[PDB]
């Protein structure tokens, strides 16, 4: 029946300055209209119920405006710690219960260029057959970054894949981890392993390598 | 101070039937106070309601799965479970059980339980190895977590002591159709030696359990 429509799907600001997002409804409401935070991995928390009035331990910093068909959420100052998904949610005095899609707010920050550490393979896991060359980039900023494997001095394609953290909370940066899959009987193969990382707070693309067998 | 858990198999068949059940505490289920409820959320997407409970017996369902939700409660147990038949891939999510307040106040989902990952596949559950990626004024540690399935695991650092600097990273499906994933932490260079780095591997879905100590090399 009712329908909740948030608006926008994912924003982008600076820490301090001032956000707003926008939930729709298909009627005249009038119902509820109540604001959840939900930071990934975890359940989400209730910020404000029946449209203005803030749940408890709740920052000042968030303020709720609306009635009828429109409805804002408002974080008077963006803070690291709002990286989050906000949903409004809809109800009556009995159920049935709408969510909105969500509205995912991200932070913009300082340029941070990345820490780079290599892993090789551990001698565990060479036991078992497989060769995985780990390459780490800690707590950079912006998330857009280029990671290349070259093995013996050969570019390589295909056998690398990577994954990326949410923003972190408290200073707003990615980490991202580099995974190239080898078997052991071609791990053995070579001796140079290098991984490049291209990002914009580097001047120049930076190599870490290890020769195998040399510690 | 109300909490909810659930307890669910994880991995369901498709076309086979969900069964997940939330123990409550701190409150009894056959309060007037209540609806209970269940919500799930697919891996990047939002929050979807799919059904909840009072006491009578008063079931409200989504119009959208109305179909196939069943939704009881059990007040010698305090429990309330949730029946999905005919489970699809699009089923697939993160399960939640929460309550909601019926008479004091708006209806909002006061508390959540955690969440409870059902992935609908015929793939065997696979408990995960363990690799060290040993250290060598900053210095990177971790745990390589491979060939599991189907997700989550659940990594610590010395039983949660450690919780600065550490990154578990999402987990990547694999040619093979295993996960892996990689957990991280960023320490001292000083402590290496006189600080020990253990990280602590839960899979559920395998009722596996490993602790793998990282050294340096
Ligand atoms: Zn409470
Ligand atoms: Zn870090």
Redesign the pocket.
């Known amino acids: 029946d009712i329908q909740m429509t948030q608006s926008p799907s994912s924003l982008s600001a600076s820490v301090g300055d001032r956000v707003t997002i926008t939930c729709r409804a298909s009627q005249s409401l009038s119902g509820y209209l109540n604001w959840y935070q939900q930071k990934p991995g975890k359940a989400p928390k209730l910020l404000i119920y029946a449209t203005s009035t803030l749940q408890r331990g709740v920052p000042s910093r968030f303020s709720g405006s609306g009635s009828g068909t429109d409805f804002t959420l408002t974080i008077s100052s963006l803070q690291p710690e709002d990286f989050a998904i906000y949903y409004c949610q809809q109800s009556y005095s009995t159920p049935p219960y709408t969510f909105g899609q969500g509205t995912k707010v991200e932070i913009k920050r300082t340029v941070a260029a990345p820490?780079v550490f290599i892993f090789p393979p551990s001698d565990e896991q060479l036991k078992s057959g497989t060769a995985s060359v780990v390459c780490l980039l800690?707590?950079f900023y912006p998330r857009e970054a280029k990671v290349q494997w070259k093995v013996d001095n050969a570019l390589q394609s295909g056998n690398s894949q990577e994954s990326v953290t949410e923003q972190?909370s408290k200073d707003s940066?990615y980490?991202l981890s580099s995974t190239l899959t080898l078997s052991k009987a071609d791990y053995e193969k070579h001796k140079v392993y290098a991984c490049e990382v291209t990002h914009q707070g580097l001047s120049s693309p930076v190599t870490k390598s290890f020769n195998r067998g040399e510690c | 101070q109300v909490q909810l858990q659930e307890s669910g198999p994880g991995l369901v068949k498709p076309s086979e039937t969900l069964s997940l059940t939330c123990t409550v505490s701190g409150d009894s289920v056959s309060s007037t106070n209540y609806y209970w409820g269940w919500i799930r959320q697919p891996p990047g997407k939002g929050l979807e309601w799919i059904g909840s409970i009072y006491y009578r017996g008063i079931t409200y369902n989504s119009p959208s799965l109305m179909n196939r939700v069943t939704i009881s409660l059990d007040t010698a147990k305090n429990q309330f479970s949730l029946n999905l038949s005919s489970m699809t891939a699009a089923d697939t999510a993160v399960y939640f059980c929460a309550n909601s307040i019926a008479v004091s106040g708006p209806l909002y989902f006061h508390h959540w339980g955690q969440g409870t990952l059902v992935t609908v596949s015929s793939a065997s559950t696979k408990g995960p190895s363990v690799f060290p990626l040993a250290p060598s004024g900053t210095a990177?540690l971790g745990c390589l977590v491979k060939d599991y399935f189907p997700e989550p695991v659940t990594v610590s650092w010395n039983s949660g002591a450690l919780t600065s600097?550490?990154?578990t990273f999402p987990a990547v499906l694999q040619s093979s159709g295993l996960y892996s994933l990689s957990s991280?932490?960023?320490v001292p260079s000083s402590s290496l030696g006189t600080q020990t780095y253990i990280c602590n591997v839960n899979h559920k879905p395998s009722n596996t359990k490993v602790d793998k100590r990282v050294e340096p090399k």
């Open positions: 820490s800690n707590n972190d940066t980490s | 990177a600097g550490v990154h991280v932490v960023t």
